[PDB]
Amino acid sequence: GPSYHCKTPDCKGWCFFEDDVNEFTCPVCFHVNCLLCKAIHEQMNCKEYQEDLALRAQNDVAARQTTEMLKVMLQQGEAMRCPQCQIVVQKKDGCDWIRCTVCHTEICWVTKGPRWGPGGPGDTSGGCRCRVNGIPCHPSCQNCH
Ligand SMILES: [Zn+2]
Ligand SMILES: [Zn+2]
Ligand SMILES: [Zn+2]
Ligand SMILES: [Zn+2]
Ligand SMILES: [Zn+2]
């Protein structure tokens, strides 16, 4: 069970990652962190945050740093786009499964795509079909729900 450090400057707030929890309310500074954007964006959904962050690339050097950082993460695994709404999702250490914050699509992190077909939970006509006939979606999978 790995951990996340609050993004408020110099804050000592931290949490463990949990499969079903995508937001961290810091007990120190009380700010709400988003555990898939790794950022505090309390008047935005994740899509509004990520688009505005790309608009600050022209030009903030800090934003341009992180936006180009993310584009290497996506091009090399350790980050991915939601297969449904296409927001950039970053890893939650120890969690093989994530429910998108914007569209609520279940994402299989092990296989870097959807958990299920359209029609959602139970539809093994798409997605990673973990455990059908006993086979895990990947032999490293431990629990993608
Ligand atoms: Zn904090
Ligand atoms: Zn977010
Ligand atoms: Zn989504
Ligand atoms: Zn899976
Ligand atoms: Zn699996």
Which ligand is nearest the CA of 27, by number? 1
How remote is the CA of residue 87 from the centroid of ligand 4, in Å? 19
Return the SS3 of 116. Answer: coil
Question: How far is residue 127's CA from residue 38's CA, in Å, rounded to a whole number?
Answer: 26
Q: How many domains does the chain have?
A: 1
Domain assignment present for 15: yes
Domain assignment present for 16: yes
Domain assignment present for 83: no
**According to the entry, how was the structure determined?**
X-ray
Cis peptide before 59 (omega within 30 of 0): yes
141 among the known binding-site residues? no
Stated resolution in angstroms: 2.2
29 among the known binding-site residues? yes
- Provide CB contacts within 8 A for 103, sequence distance 6+: 82, 84, 85
DSSP-derived secondary structure for 36-98: TTTB--TTS-HHHHHHHHHHTTTT-HHHHHHHHHHHHHHHTSSEEE-TTT--EEE--TT-SEE
Domain assignment present for 79: no
The answer to whether 82 and 89 are in contact (CB under 8 A) is yes
* Full residue range of the structural domain in which residue 30 is found: 3-34
User: Cα 21 vs. chain centroid, distance in angstroms?
Assistant: 11
Picking from 8, 49, 44, 50, the residue whose alpha carbon sits closest to that of residue 29 is 8
Domain assignment present for 28: yes
Domain assignment present for 133: no
The answer to whether 79 and 88 are in contact (CB under 8 A) is yes
How remote is the CA of residue 123 from the centroid of ligand 2, in Å? 27
Is residue 128 flagged as an active site residue? no
Q: Which of 95, 130, 141, 144 is catalytic?
A: 95
Question: How far is residue 100's CA from residue 125's CA, in Å, rounded to a whole number?
Answer: 20
Return the SS3 of 106. Answer: strand
Burial class of 120 by CB neighbour count within 10 A (0 to 12, 13 to 18, 19+): middle
The answer to whether 45 and 36 are in contact (CB under 8 A) is no
46 among the known binding-site residues? yes
Which ligand is nearest the CA of 115, by number? 4
**β-strands 97-99, 79-81 pairing:** unpaired
How remote is the CA of residue 34 from the centroid of ligand 1, in Å? 12
Domain assignment present for 62: no
34 among the known binding-site residues? yes
How remote is the CA of residue 91 from the centroid of ligand 1, in Å? 20
Token duo for residue 128: 């990673």
